[PDB]
Amino acid sequence: AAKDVKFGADARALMLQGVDLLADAVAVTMGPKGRTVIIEQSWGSPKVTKDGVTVAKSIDLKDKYKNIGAKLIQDVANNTNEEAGDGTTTATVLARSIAKEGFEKISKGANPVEIRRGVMLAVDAVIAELKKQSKPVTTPEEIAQVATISANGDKEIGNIISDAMKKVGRKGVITVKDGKTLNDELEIIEGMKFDRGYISPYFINTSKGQKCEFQDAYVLLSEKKISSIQSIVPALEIANAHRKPLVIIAEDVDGEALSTLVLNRLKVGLQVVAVKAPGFGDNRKNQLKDMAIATGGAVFGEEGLTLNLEDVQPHDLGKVGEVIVTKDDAMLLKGKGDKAQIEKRIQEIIEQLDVTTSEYEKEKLNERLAKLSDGVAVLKVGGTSDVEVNEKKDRVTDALNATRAAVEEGIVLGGGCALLRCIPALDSLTPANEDQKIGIEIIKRTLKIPAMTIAKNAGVEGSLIVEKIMQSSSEVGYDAMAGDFVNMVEKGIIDPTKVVRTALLDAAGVASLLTTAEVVVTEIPKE
Amino acid sequence: AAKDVKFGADARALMLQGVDLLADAVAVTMGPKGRTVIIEQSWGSPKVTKDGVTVAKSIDLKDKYKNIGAKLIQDVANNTNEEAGDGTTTATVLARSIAKEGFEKISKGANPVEIRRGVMLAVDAVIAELKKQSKPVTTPEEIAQVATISANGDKEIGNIISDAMKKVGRKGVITVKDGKTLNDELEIIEGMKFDRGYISPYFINTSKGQKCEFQDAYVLLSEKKISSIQSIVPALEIANAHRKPLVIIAEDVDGEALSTLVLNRLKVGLQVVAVKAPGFGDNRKNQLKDMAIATGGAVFGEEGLTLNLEDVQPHDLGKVGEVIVTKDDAMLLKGKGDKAQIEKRIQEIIEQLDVTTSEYEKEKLNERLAKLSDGVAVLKVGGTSDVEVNEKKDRVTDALNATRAAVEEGIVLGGGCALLRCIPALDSLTPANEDQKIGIEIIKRTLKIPAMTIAKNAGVEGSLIVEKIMQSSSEVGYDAMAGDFVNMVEKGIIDPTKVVRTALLDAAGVASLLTTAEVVVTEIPKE
Amino acid sequence: AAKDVKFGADARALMLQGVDLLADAVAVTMGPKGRTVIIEQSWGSPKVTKDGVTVAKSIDLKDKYKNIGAKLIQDVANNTNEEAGDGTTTATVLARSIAKEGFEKISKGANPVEIRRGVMLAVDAVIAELKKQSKPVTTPEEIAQVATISANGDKEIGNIISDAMKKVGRKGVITVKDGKTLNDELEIIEGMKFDRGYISPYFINTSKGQKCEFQDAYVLLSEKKISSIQSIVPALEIANAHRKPLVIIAEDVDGEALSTLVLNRLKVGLQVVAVKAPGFGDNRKNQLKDMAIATGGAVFGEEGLTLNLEDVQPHDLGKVGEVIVTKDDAMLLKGKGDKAQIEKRIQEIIEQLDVTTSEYEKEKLNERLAKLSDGVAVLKVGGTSDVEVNEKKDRVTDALNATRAAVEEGIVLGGGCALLRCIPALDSLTPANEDQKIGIEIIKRTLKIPAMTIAKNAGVEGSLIVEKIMQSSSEVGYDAMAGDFVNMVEKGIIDPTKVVRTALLDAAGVASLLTTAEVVVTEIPKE
Ligand SMILES: Nc1ncnc2c1ncn2[C@@H]1O[C@H](COP(=O)(O)OP(=O)(O)OP(=O)(O)O)[C@@H](O)[C@H]1O
Ligand SMILES: Nc1ncnc2c1ncn2[C@@H]1O[C@H](COP(=O)(O)OP(=O)(O)OP(=O)(O)O)[C@@H](O)[C@H]1O
Ligand SMILES: Nc1ncnc2c1ncn2[C@@H]1O[C@H](COP(=O)(O)OP(=O)(O)OP(=O)(O)O)[C@@H](O)[C@H]1O
Ligand SMILES: [K+]
Ligand SMILES: [K+]
Ligand SMILES: [K+]
Ligand SMILES: [Mg+2]
Ligand SMILES: [Mg+2]
Ligand SMILES: [Mg+2]
């Protein structure tokens, strides 16, 4: 394949043109006053979206040289989306700013590698300052405010998320599905999440979602590994006799048993799924007992009152109404166990919580209580047509991800003012030479970009707004939706720290490497 | 694939051009004085229709940017057709008006999201007013008037529909079929409608209507799911040797059996279709044995006197005269079961009705007896050629859908006067800011469109007609066919409330979302 | 697929151009002085024809808009050909006239739907007048005149058809085959025709005609349905032993026996065909025993002196010289029954004719006598080459269809004067408004077209001929072949009523619907 080679400023200009095009397309959706982007779909209706990485991933350019910058910005946005789940537009605009400054600061005597090192040093200092200034979340009002801010100022989504996390706890399970009505509905379904996926992908019974879903499934628990075929055949016979699916939760399944299960499922049609038993040692036995009590079943392989898998009986297996299994996790939703046994187990765990003072035991008992009690939550998004339902689902997912991020770590000022207050942290750095000084100055100039973009999207002059923000007190910022300078914390314009630091880190790490190029090699287009 | 990105007013202008073209094509058919549209068919004679969604779905534009607006208006029309079954042209014209106003009201300082929120609020207020103004239907004359109005003023269609619903009840089953004479006639045929769609879309054997039509097909039943390939091979062999279609009524069809069926149908040509079994548990078995007696077949998989699917022999399966299957519902009309067993099960059901007094059991038994006794009504339309028969079928289907809608809910003034009287309901709203006020004004101006279009199609000026209507009393409207201001209720120009509110809701919900776009991304054309 | 949309007079002009082209091509063949059309055939010699439907079906235009009008006129011609079997050119010219008038009478204030309604009312009135003016056929001279007029003035064909219907009765069976000589021949073959097709397409033993032909076949009759395989296996054994084809005529054949017959015919090669038993109840038994005595066989399953099927013997099966069976009907020509039973049964049928006086029994006995006595008649068309043989066969088929139509219903004046005398019938109609009056006027102007076209093809001025005709008495018309005004009834220029009313109805029904169009949607041609 013949190739074309470009040298010097021409390649930089072409790649900067590509980066500018992609970032200008992306940045129109930033802020409370941003607008949407319509993307043509080949198989049906066009998709209307406000999500930054969704816009970034859908732009490919005919030119070979601009496509390089487009792909690099796409990489920035995708990394930011995967690591944090939010703040892709901020990463895109920061990447464009850093790339433009780096391209403009290249001369014959300049050393781009030392500029990259200085940029990395400044970014590390800013991240340290951000972590120092962070504060934790303690009240449900903060959760509601975070959810509302992340959902483009929709208060109903924030209230729904806050109520869901009240009902299922701060570490509960929340799932988003498309609805069939005009309003949003929240349903609380009992269940557990034991952080174990399926052993073999042959158990998948659907083509969409890549999950194994069974209804009214039998529960099979074994403390020890399943090796003998005769220890599992009667269970399969019982499951087939009742025409009900079977769920196998043991320590491990060897090759012979797994092959037999796969062959029976593919040929006969038995709905059998085997997963790894969660926990280790004592915790594994405790959690097996927990599911046995919850589903009304029993634990096989235990030393005390040992019950063998060979003489398995229908009454020795628990019943679960619905099972959902994926490659990362699996859930059993509604068991059929007696309430008395569940109450006894809960009381025993509560008593054991007050017996010993240790992090490990207390955390394990709290996890067991949460699994046995909280359950899962499902959110249904309503609307009239598919496009608006999809857009609302995107906003709800972004709000959920941002709320989880703000629960894991602390929160900072929103509206782009968090990065502005970290500029004085760059005054404590001592560059080793001129190039590190150039990099530090590039980062210092770049740190003002998010606030300027948010102000510009609102129809005002960003420079004056940023200058006024920097001259006010530490708690005063700009309210773009209202157009007034207000107390950010009191008005509830707050953002997670994780999203901000992740976006800054990814943008800097990719753009600084991009700005060190001298030669670009691309393939000649074919006919 | 390379993509093209457009910014600002260019994309909006192109999308508006596409929307204007599609809506101008659609709107010529609205009103009693509307005209028809000829759509070319690639496999035969051209199709002449007066139906709005049929015209809308058949317009695709070469330009990539106008096609987005075309697809969005097509989605509006399709949603209106699926939810209500009538009023697609009204939805199309309202959508065009809202889109044009929204595109005209976008400026640098405007916030389209708040405009959309205001539009939604105004639409909700108007819908509440419409629900308040509605009145129910009490006499068959109102039904005849509704059917006549919905059928483009054809009194014979209204009379025949009124007679049919008198004979089979207001909540019966009515079907439309091709006639072989010059006139329309009504016949009563016993049958059942079990309310289930088809498993796979590959079973469609027709080009028009998106349905599955077989004649003189056998019936296969299975209480349990069909999984093994060999459990279904003898039935397929029987269907092939007997050279007649086959119908499978199973709990579910897994991937292997479905793949075998679709490959056999595509390669050999067997007319086989599988649909989901209606009901659950005991009701499921009751309905399956319902249809077993109705067809004279047998129920497979039952615990008592179990009969396997592997040894199926033709007297173990029933026969039906004709099969109608669509994605939502399916029916089998003329079974071949003997009368004695049907009667004996009828008396056992009426006896079971007298055994227990409970809502669930009584409702299930009433549904079963209605299915086994009342039967369906078939309408046959007359004509000399296929084109006029198809046009009359479209009009009769629209009339039936509108009659059902006006039976479920109330009726309002026709001719577009229902929305005009709801304009004062918008004067009690207090917008939160300028943008919500702009949205409310957009909706207020849009509410006059249907009456103006109906008047314009009649060859007069719509503005003067609307102005004179708004200055008259509450019960006075414009008769487009006669050209006189008359009492709508006395003259019988009335519309269902459900159709009006559905059309308005879908039109607003899609057009307001469309009017918030800033960037359009389309794929570059290929060679 | 990209599509093109046209509005207003452009689409109407294009469709009118297409209609004018097709009708101008068709109309040159109308009348006694019409000319022929040569149509290219891709696989051999060109086809020379004078039939209107054949010419219409072979014109396809490159332009997408003219092709719509072409297809509509083709639909008119095909419907007229399928319904009456004659008068396709009249339908084509009437359709063109109505379409042209309707396109000319469209303005801003016009309502085409009311115009269509007025057209339908006018057509109904004209058809009622035509039915009033009809008179029946009573003499062979009228039949000869009808056949001669329909055969383009060929007296030999008329004489042959008159002789054939004299020999085999007015409700006899006449078939046309290719001849191998220079002259036309009529041959009389005894036989019976029971109006029943065969059960399964698998019995076809040829590629041309889609009919099953056996020679020197056995006859098996069963009063009841054949269910047991052992009740039929000896029949195939006897048929294979004598190496003769077998024809089975039973009430019905179940799936098992049909599959066995198909398998044996495909693998072994036995010439067996299954057909349905004609007649219902007593009539079925009477037909079965009549064909049994005609073929010298016996009827199995009769209650009195029951003869079983499992012990079937060669002498129990009738013998027939040859069998012709198709989808719609089947023929048994040369049975081997003894003359004594046939003559005897003739005597008892004649006796029971005079025993009771009832329309049902008298009709059944008359059909039984016709089947047992008349037989069939075959017409062989002679010529030197294939082209002129095909043209003569087309004319003979047209004459046969017209003669059958004139036997079923009455006759009216020919030469297009039948429609002229119905113009005053339109003066008694009172239109509801202006548009219905416009439609009535359109029909009134259209009614003069056939006479004008016939006169125009003769080389004279049609307007003067029509004006002179309307000023003469009721029985005076124009003789286009001789150029004189003569008494049409005396000279034998007469036409069937069915052909005229069918052509008028079809042409009006399609053209009036066509004239209401406003928008035309066509696909962009692909390179
Ligand atoms: N009312 C408001 N006034 C000022 N700033 C606001 C207001 N509401 C939100 N913001 C800020 O605007 C930003 C919201 O941007 P947005 O959610 O569109 O994009 P993002 O965080 O880069 O990621 P994504 O596109 O994936 O959602 C955040 O920095 C948030 O703090
Ligand atoms: N004689 C009449 N005078 C005034 N208004 C009328 C008259 N007849 C019908 N209308 C009104 O005109 C409208 C009829 O619309 P039309 O039948 O063209 O299509 P639609 O309801 O939008 O749906 P679709 O095309 O799917 O059938 C209704 O609002 C009806 O109330
Ligand atoms: N000698 C005649 N003088 C005047 N009119 C005649 C004479 N012979 C026949 N006609 C009339 O001319 C017409 C014959 O038309 P022609 O046979 O060309 O076609 P057609 O009946 O329209 O149908 P097709 O083309 O399918 O055979 C009839 O209306 C018939 O009454
Ligand atoms: K965004
Ligand atoms: K319409
Ligand atoms: K002709
Ligand atoms: Mg965000
Ligand atoms: Mg309608
Ligand atoms: Mg003729």
mmCIF file with all atom_site columns, N, CA and C in Angstrom, chain B residues 380-410:
data_model
loop_
_atom_site.group_PDB
_atom_site.id
_atom_site.type_symbol
_atom_site.label_atom_id
_atom_site.label_alt_id
_atom_site.label_comp_id
_atom_site.label_asym_id
_atom_site.label_entity_id
_atom_site.label_seq_id
_atom_site.pdbx_PDB_ins_code
_atom_site.Cartn_x
_atom_site.Cartn_y
_atom_site.Cartn_z
_atom_site.occupancy
_atom_site.B_iso_or_equiv
_atom_site.pdbx_formal_charge
_atom_site.auth_seq_id
_atom_site.auth_comp_id
_atom_site.auth_asym_id
_atom_site.auth_atom_id
_atom_site.pdbx_PDB_model_num
ATOM 1  N N  . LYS B 1 380 ? -67.582 -7.243 4.132  1.00 0.00 ? 380 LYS B N  1
ATOM 2  C CA . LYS B 1 380 ? -67.077 -7.400 2.775  1.00 0.00 ? 380 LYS B CA 1
ATOM 3  C C  . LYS B 1 380 ? -67.443 -6.169 1.959  1.00 0.00 ? 380 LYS B C  1
ATOM 4  N N  . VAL B 1 381 ? -66.439 -5.541 1.357  1.00 0.00 ? 381 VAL B N  1
ATOM 5  C CA . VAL B 1 381 ? -66.622 -4.289 0.635  1.00 0.00 ? 381 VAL B CA 1
ATOM 6  C C  . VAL B 1 381 ? -66.731 -4.590 -0.855 1.00 0.00 ? 381 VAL B C  1
ATOM 7  N N  . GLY B 1 382 ? -67.595 -3.848 -1.547 1.00 0.00 ? 382 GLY B N  1
ATOM 8  C CA . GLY B 1 382 ? -67.810 -4.070 -2.957 1.00 0.00 ? 382 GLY B CA 1
ATOM 9  C C  . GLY B 1 382 ? -66.973 -3.166 -3.843 1.00 0.00 ? 382 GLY B C  1
ATOM 10 N N  . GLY B 1 383 ? -66.946 -3.505 -5.125 1.00 0.00 ? 383 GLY B N  1
ATOM 11 C CA . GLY B 1 383 ? -66.205 -2.720 -6.092 1.00 0.00 ? 383 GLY B CA 1
ATOM 12 C C  . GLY B 1 383 ? -66.068 -3.475 -7.393 1.00 0.00 ? 383 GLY B C  1
ATOM 13 N N  . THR B 1 384 ? -65.557 -2.761 -8.395 1.00 0.00 ? 384 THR B N  1
ATOM 14 C CA . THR B 1 384 ? -65.339 -3.346 -9.712 1.00 0.00 ? 384 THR B CA 1
ATOM 15 C C  . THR B 1 384 ? -63.886 -3.743 -9.935 1.00 0.00 ? 384 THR B C  1
ATOM 16 N N  . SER B 1 385 ? -62.947 -3.021 -9.330 1.00 0.00 ? 385 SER B N  1
ATOM 17 C CA . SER B 1 385 ? -61.524 -3.282 -9.490 1.00 0.00 ? 385 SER B CA 1
ATOM 18 C C  . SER B 1 385 ? -60.872 -3.367 -8.117 1.00 0.00 ? 385 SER B C  1
ATOM 19 N N  . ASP B 1 386 ? -59.558 -3.595 -8.113 1.00 0.00 ? 386 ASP B N  1
ATOM 20 C CA . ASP B 1 386 ? -58.832 -3.711 -6.853 1.00 0.00 ? 386 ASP B CA 1
ATOM 21 C C  . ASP B 1 386 ? -58.574 -2.347 -6.224 1.00 0.00 ? 386 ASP B C  1
ATOM 22 N N  . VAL B 1 387 ? -58.388 -1.312 -7.046 1.00 0.00 ? 387 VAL B N  1
ATOM 23 C CA . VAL B 1 387 ? -57.990 -0.006 -6.524 1.00 0.00 ? 387 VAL B CA 1
ATOM 24 C C  . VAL B 1 387 ? -59.095 0.589  -5.657 1.00 0.00 ? 387 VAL B C  1
ATOM 25 N N  . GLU B 1 388 ? -60.325 0.610  -6.177 1.00 0.00 ? 388 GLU B N  1
ATOM 26 C CA . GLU B 1 388 ? -61.419 1.208  -5.421 1.00 0.00 ? 388 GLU B CA 1
ATOM 27 C C  . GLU B 1 388 ? -61.790 0.349  -4.220 1.00 0.00 ? 388 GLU B C  1
ATOM 28 N N  . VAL B 1 389 ? -61.633 -0.971 -4.339 1.00 0.00 ? 389 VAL B N  1
ATOM 29 C CA . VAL B 1 389 ? -61.856 -1.846 -3.193 1.00 0.00 ? 389 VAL B CA 1
ATOM 30 C C  . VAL B 1 389 ? -60.854 -1.539 -2.088 1.00 0.00 ? 389 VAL B C  1
ATOM 31 N N  . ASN B 1 390 ? -59.586 -1.332 -2.451 1.00 0.00 ? 390 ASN B N  1
ATOM 32 C CA . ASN B 1 390 ? -58.577 -0.987 -1.454 1.00 0.00 ? 390 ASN B CA 1
ATOM 33 C C  . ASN B 1 390 ? -58.874 0.359  -0.801 1.00 0.00 ? 390 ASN B C  1
ATOM 34 N N  . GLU B 1 391 ? -59.283 1.349  -1.598 1.00 0.00 ? 391 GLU B N  1
ATOM 35 C CA . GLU B 1 391 ? -59.619 2.656  -1.035 1.00 0.00 ? 391 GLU B CA 1
ATOM 36 C C  . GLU B 1 391 ? -60.787 2.546  -0.058 1.00 0.00 ? 391 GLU B C  1
ATOM 37 N N  . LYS B 1 392 ? -61.825 1.800  -0.441 1.00 0.00 ? 392 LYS B N  1
ATOM 38 C CA . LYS B 1 392 ? -62.965 1.613  0.445  1.00 0.00 ? 392 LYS B CA 1
ATOM 39 C C  . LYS B 1 392 ? -62.580 0.838  1.697  1.00 0.00 ? 392 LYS B C  1
ATOM 40 N N  . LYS B 1 393 ? -61.666 -0.129 1.578  1.00 0.00 ? 393 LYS B N  1
ATOM 41 C CA . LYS B 1 393 ? -61.174 -0.831 2.758  1.00 0.00 ? 393 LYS B CA 1
ATOM 42 C C  . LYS B 1 393 ? -60.473 0.121  3.711  1.00 0.00 ? 393 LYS B C  1
ATOM 43 N N  . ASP B 1 394 ? -59.649 1.023  3.175  1.00 0.00 ? 394 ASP B N  1
ATOM 44 C CA . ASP B 1 394 ? -58.981 2.003  4.026  1.00 0.00 ? 394 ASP B CA 1
ATOM 45 C C  . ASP B 1 394 ? -59.999 2.865  4.761  1.00 0.00 ? 394 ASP B C  1
ATOM 46 N N  . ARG B 1 395 ? -61.016 3.342  4.039  1.00 0.00 ? 395 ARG B N  1
ATOM 47 C CA . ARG B 1 395 ? -62.023 4.188  4.677  1.00 0.00 ? 395 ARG B CA 1
ATOM 48 C C  . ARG B 1 395 ? -62.812 3.420  5.736  1.00 0.00 ? 395 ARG B C  1
ATOM 49 N N  . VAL B 1 396 ? -63.159 2.163  5.455  1.00 0.00 ? 396 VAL B N  1
ATOM 50 C CA . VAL B 1 396 ? -63.921 1.368  6.414  1.00 0.00 ? 396 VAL B CA 1
ATOM 51 C C  . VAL B 1 396 ? -63.089 1.074  7.657  1.00 0.00 ? 396 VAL B C  1
ATOM 52 N N  . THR B 1 397 ? -61.798 0.786  7.479  1.00 0.00 ? 397 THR B N  1
ATOM 53 C CA . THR B 1 397 ? -60.928 0.559  8.629  1.00 0.00 ? 397 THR B CA 1
ATOM 54 C C  . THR B 1 397 ? -60.812 1.814  9.483  1.00 0.00 ? 397 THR B C  1
ATOM 55 N N  . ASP B 1 398 ? -60.669 2.978  8.841  1.00 0.00 ? 398 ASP B N  1
ATOM 56 C CA . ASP B 1 398 ? -60.633 4.227  9.596  1.00 0.00 ? 398 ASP B CA 1
ATOM 57 C C  . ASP B 1 398 ? -61.929 4.435  10.369 1.00 0.00 ? 398 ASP B C  1
ATOM 58 N N  . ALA B 1 399 ? -63.069 4.155  9.733  1.00 0.00 ? 399 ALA B N  1
ATOM 59 C CA . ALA B 1 399 ? -64.353 4.316  10.407 1.00 0.00 ? 399 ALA B CA 1
ATOM 60 C C  . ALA B 1 399 ? -64.475 3.382  11.603 1.00 0.00 ? 399 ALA B C  1
ATOM 61 N N  . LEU B 1 400 ? -64.046 2.127  11.451 1.00 0.00 ? 400 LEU B N  1
ATOM 62 C CA . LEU B 1 400 ? -64.115 1.181  12.561 1.00 0.00 ? 400 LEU B CA 1
ATOM 63 C C  . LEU B 1 400 ? -63.234 1.621  13.723 1.00 0.00 ? 400 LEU B C  1
ATOM 64 N N  . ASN B 1 401 ? -62.009 2.063  13.426 1.00 0.00 ? 401 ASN B N  1
ATOM 65 C CA . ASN B 1 401 ? -61.115 2.511  14.488 1.00 0.00 ? 401 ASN B CA 1
ATOM 66 C C  . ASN B 1 401 ? -61.689 3.722  15.213 1.00 0.00 ? 401 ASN B C  1
ATOM 67 N N  . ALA B 1 402 ? -62.231 4.683  14.460 1.00 0.00 ? 402 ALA B N  1
ATOM 68 C CA . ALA B 1 402 ? -62.811 5.865  15.086 1.00 0.00 ? 402 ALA B CA 1
ATOM 69 C C  . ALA B 1 402 ? -64.038 5.510  15.914 1.00 0.00 ? 402 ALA B C  1
ATOM 70 N N  . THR B 1 403 ? -64.852 4.563  15.441 1.00 0.00 ? 403 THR B N  1
ATOM 71 C CA . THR B 1 403 ? -66.016 4.138  16.211 1.00 0.00 ? 403 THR B CA 1
ATOM 72 C C  . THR B 1 403 ? -65.603 3.481  17.522 1.00 0.00 ? 403 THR B C  1
ATOM 73 N N  . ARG B 1 404 ? -64.584 2.620  17.485 1.00 0.00 ? 404 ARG B N  1
ATOM 74 C CA . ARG B 1 404 ? -64.106 2.014  18.724 1.00 0.00 ? 404 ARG B CA 1
ATOM 75 C C  . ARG B 1 404 ? -63.558 3.070  19.678 1.00 0.00 ? 404 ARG B C  1
ATOM 76 N N  . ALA B 1 405 ? -62.818 4.048  19.147 1.00 0.00 ? 405 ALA B N  1
ATOM 77 C CA . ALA B 1 405 ? -62.288 5.112  19.993 1.00 0.00 ? 405 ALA B CA 1
ATOM 78 C C  . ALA B 1 405 ? -63.409 5.927  20.629 1.00 0.00 ? 405 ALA B C  1
ATOM 79 N N  . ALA B 1 406 ? -64.450 6.247  19.858 1.00 0.00 ? 406 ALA B N  1
ATOM 80 C CA . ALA B 1 406 ? -65.583 6.997  20.384 1.00 0.00 ? 406 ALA B CA 1
ATOM 81 C C  . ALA B 1 406 ? -66.472 6.161  21.293 1.00 0.00 ? 406 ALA B C  1
ATOM 82 N N  . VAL B 1 407 ? -66.335 4.838  21.271 1.00 0.00 ? 407 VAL B N  1
ATOM 83 C CA . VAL B 1 407 ? -67.033 4.016  22.255 1.00 0.00 ? 407 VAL B CA 1
ATOM 84 C C  . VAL B 1 407 ? -66.253 3.968  23.564 1.00 0.00 ? 407 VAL B C  1
ATOM 85 N N  . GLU B 1 408 ? -64.926 3.841  23.487 1.00 0.00 ? 408 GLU B N  1
ATOM 86 C CA . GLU B 1 408 ? -64.119 3.780  24.704 1.00 0.00 ? 408 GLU B CA 1
ATOM 87 C C  . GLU B 1 408 ? -64.209 5.079  25.499 1.00 0.00 ? 408 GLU B C  1
ATOM 88 N N  . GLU B 1 409 ? -64.070 6.215  24.826 1.00 0.00 ? 409 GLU B N  1
ATOM 89 C CA . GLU B 1 409 ? -64.123 7.525  25.465 1.00 0.00 ? 409 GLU B CA 1
ATOM 90 C C  . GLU B 1 409 ? -65.249 8.351  24.841 1.00 0.00 ? 409 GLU B C  1
ATOM 91 N N  . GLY B 1 410 ? -65.291 9.632  25.187 1.00 0.00 ? 410 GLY B N  1
ATOM 92 C CA . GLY B 1 410 ? -66.359 10.505 24.750 1.00 0.00 ? 410 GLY B CA 1
ATOM 93 C C  . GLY B 1 410 ? -66.140 11.074 23.362 1.00 0.00 ? 410 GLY B C  1
#
